[PDB]
């Protein structure tokens, strides 16, 4: 297998515990904590953590998510896409992330086709206007990935299963969230690597 990556926001996991869990790297946040989100110790990834991961031969992938539910980043369409892309680009660079690496903008939702057309499309076009089509990643279910692919929005795709049919993997996905688990007392999700160039920093 190509391997697995762990994604997490609640803390910083030492490189030796990621290795012990069998993962080859981590998907990490290039976003701020929303007010009251004191538990989000893993937001954003910092310079010392990134050097620790790379120093221990682990892969790093950038992902962006500030809001959630009724504060989902994409609700504000184009203006939100510009503010959030600028912030993610800033934090990716601040943690020593290279411009060759993309940033997975999060659609941590199960949107309707209407919500996709009226809000996610301008949200994602704005991510492309800021960091470019070649650096725009999309974290979303199989339907959203399908709609984005048809509109030519995003170059990297990370499938989540909220709204994805059970057992279906979109052929455009680089990464697939599969799974309820803690690594060193930090809640994590496990992600299968499906394509060899999946947005790793190096
Ligand atoms: Na707006």
Structure write-up:
Helix content is 31%, strand content 21%. The protein has helices at residues 15-20, 47-55, 77-94, 113-131, 142-151; strands at 4-7, 25-29, 59-64, 103-106, 136-140, 156-159, 175-177, 181-183, 186-193. The protein has 202 residues and is of the alpha/beta class. It has an eight-stranded mixed β-barrel, surrounded by four helices. It has a single domain (1-202), classed as TIM Barrel (Alpha-Beta Barrel). Helix 3 crosses helix 4. The two termini are 19 Å apart. The protein contains five helices and nine strands; from the N terminus they run E-H-E-H-E-H-E-H-E-H-E-E-E-E. The protein binds sodium ion (NA). Pfam families: Rv2525c_GlyHyd-like. It comes from Mycobacterium tuberculosis (strain CDC 1551 / Oshkosh).
Short description:
InterPro entries: GH, Rv2525c-like_Glyco_Hydro-like, TAT_signal, TAT_signal_bac_arc. Helix content is 31%, strand content 21%.
């Amino acid at each position: 297998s190509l391997g697995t990556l762990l994604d997490y926001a609640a803390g910083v996991i030492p490189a030796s515990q990621i290795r012990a869990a069998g993962a080859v790297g981590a998907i990490r946040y290039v976003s701020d904590r929303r007010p009251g989100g004191a538990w989000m110790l893993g937001k954003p990834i910092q310079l010392s953590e990134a050097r620790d991961l790379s120093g221990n031969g682990l892969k790093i992938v950038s992902c962006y998510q500030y809001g959630k539910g009724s504060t989902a980043d994409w609700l504000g369409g184009a203006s939100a896409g510009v503010q959030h892309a600028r912030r993610g680009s800033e934090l990716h660079a601040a943690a020593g992330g290279p411009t060759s690496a993309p940033i997975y903008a999060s659609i941590d939702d199960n949107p309707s086709y209407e919500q996709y057309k009226n809000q996610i499309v301008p949200y994602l076009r704005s991510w492309e206007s800021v960091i470019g089509h070649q650096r725009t990643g999309v974290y979303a279910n199989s339907k959203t990935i399908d709609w984005a692919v048809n509109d030519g929005l995003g170059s990297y795709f990370w499938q989540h299963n909220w709204g994805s049919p059970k057992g279906y993997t979109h052929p455009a996905a680089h990464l697939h969230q599969v799974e309820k688990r803690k690594v060193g007392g930090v809640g994590v999700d496990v992600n299968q690597i499906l394509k060899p160039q999946f947005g790793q920093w190096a």
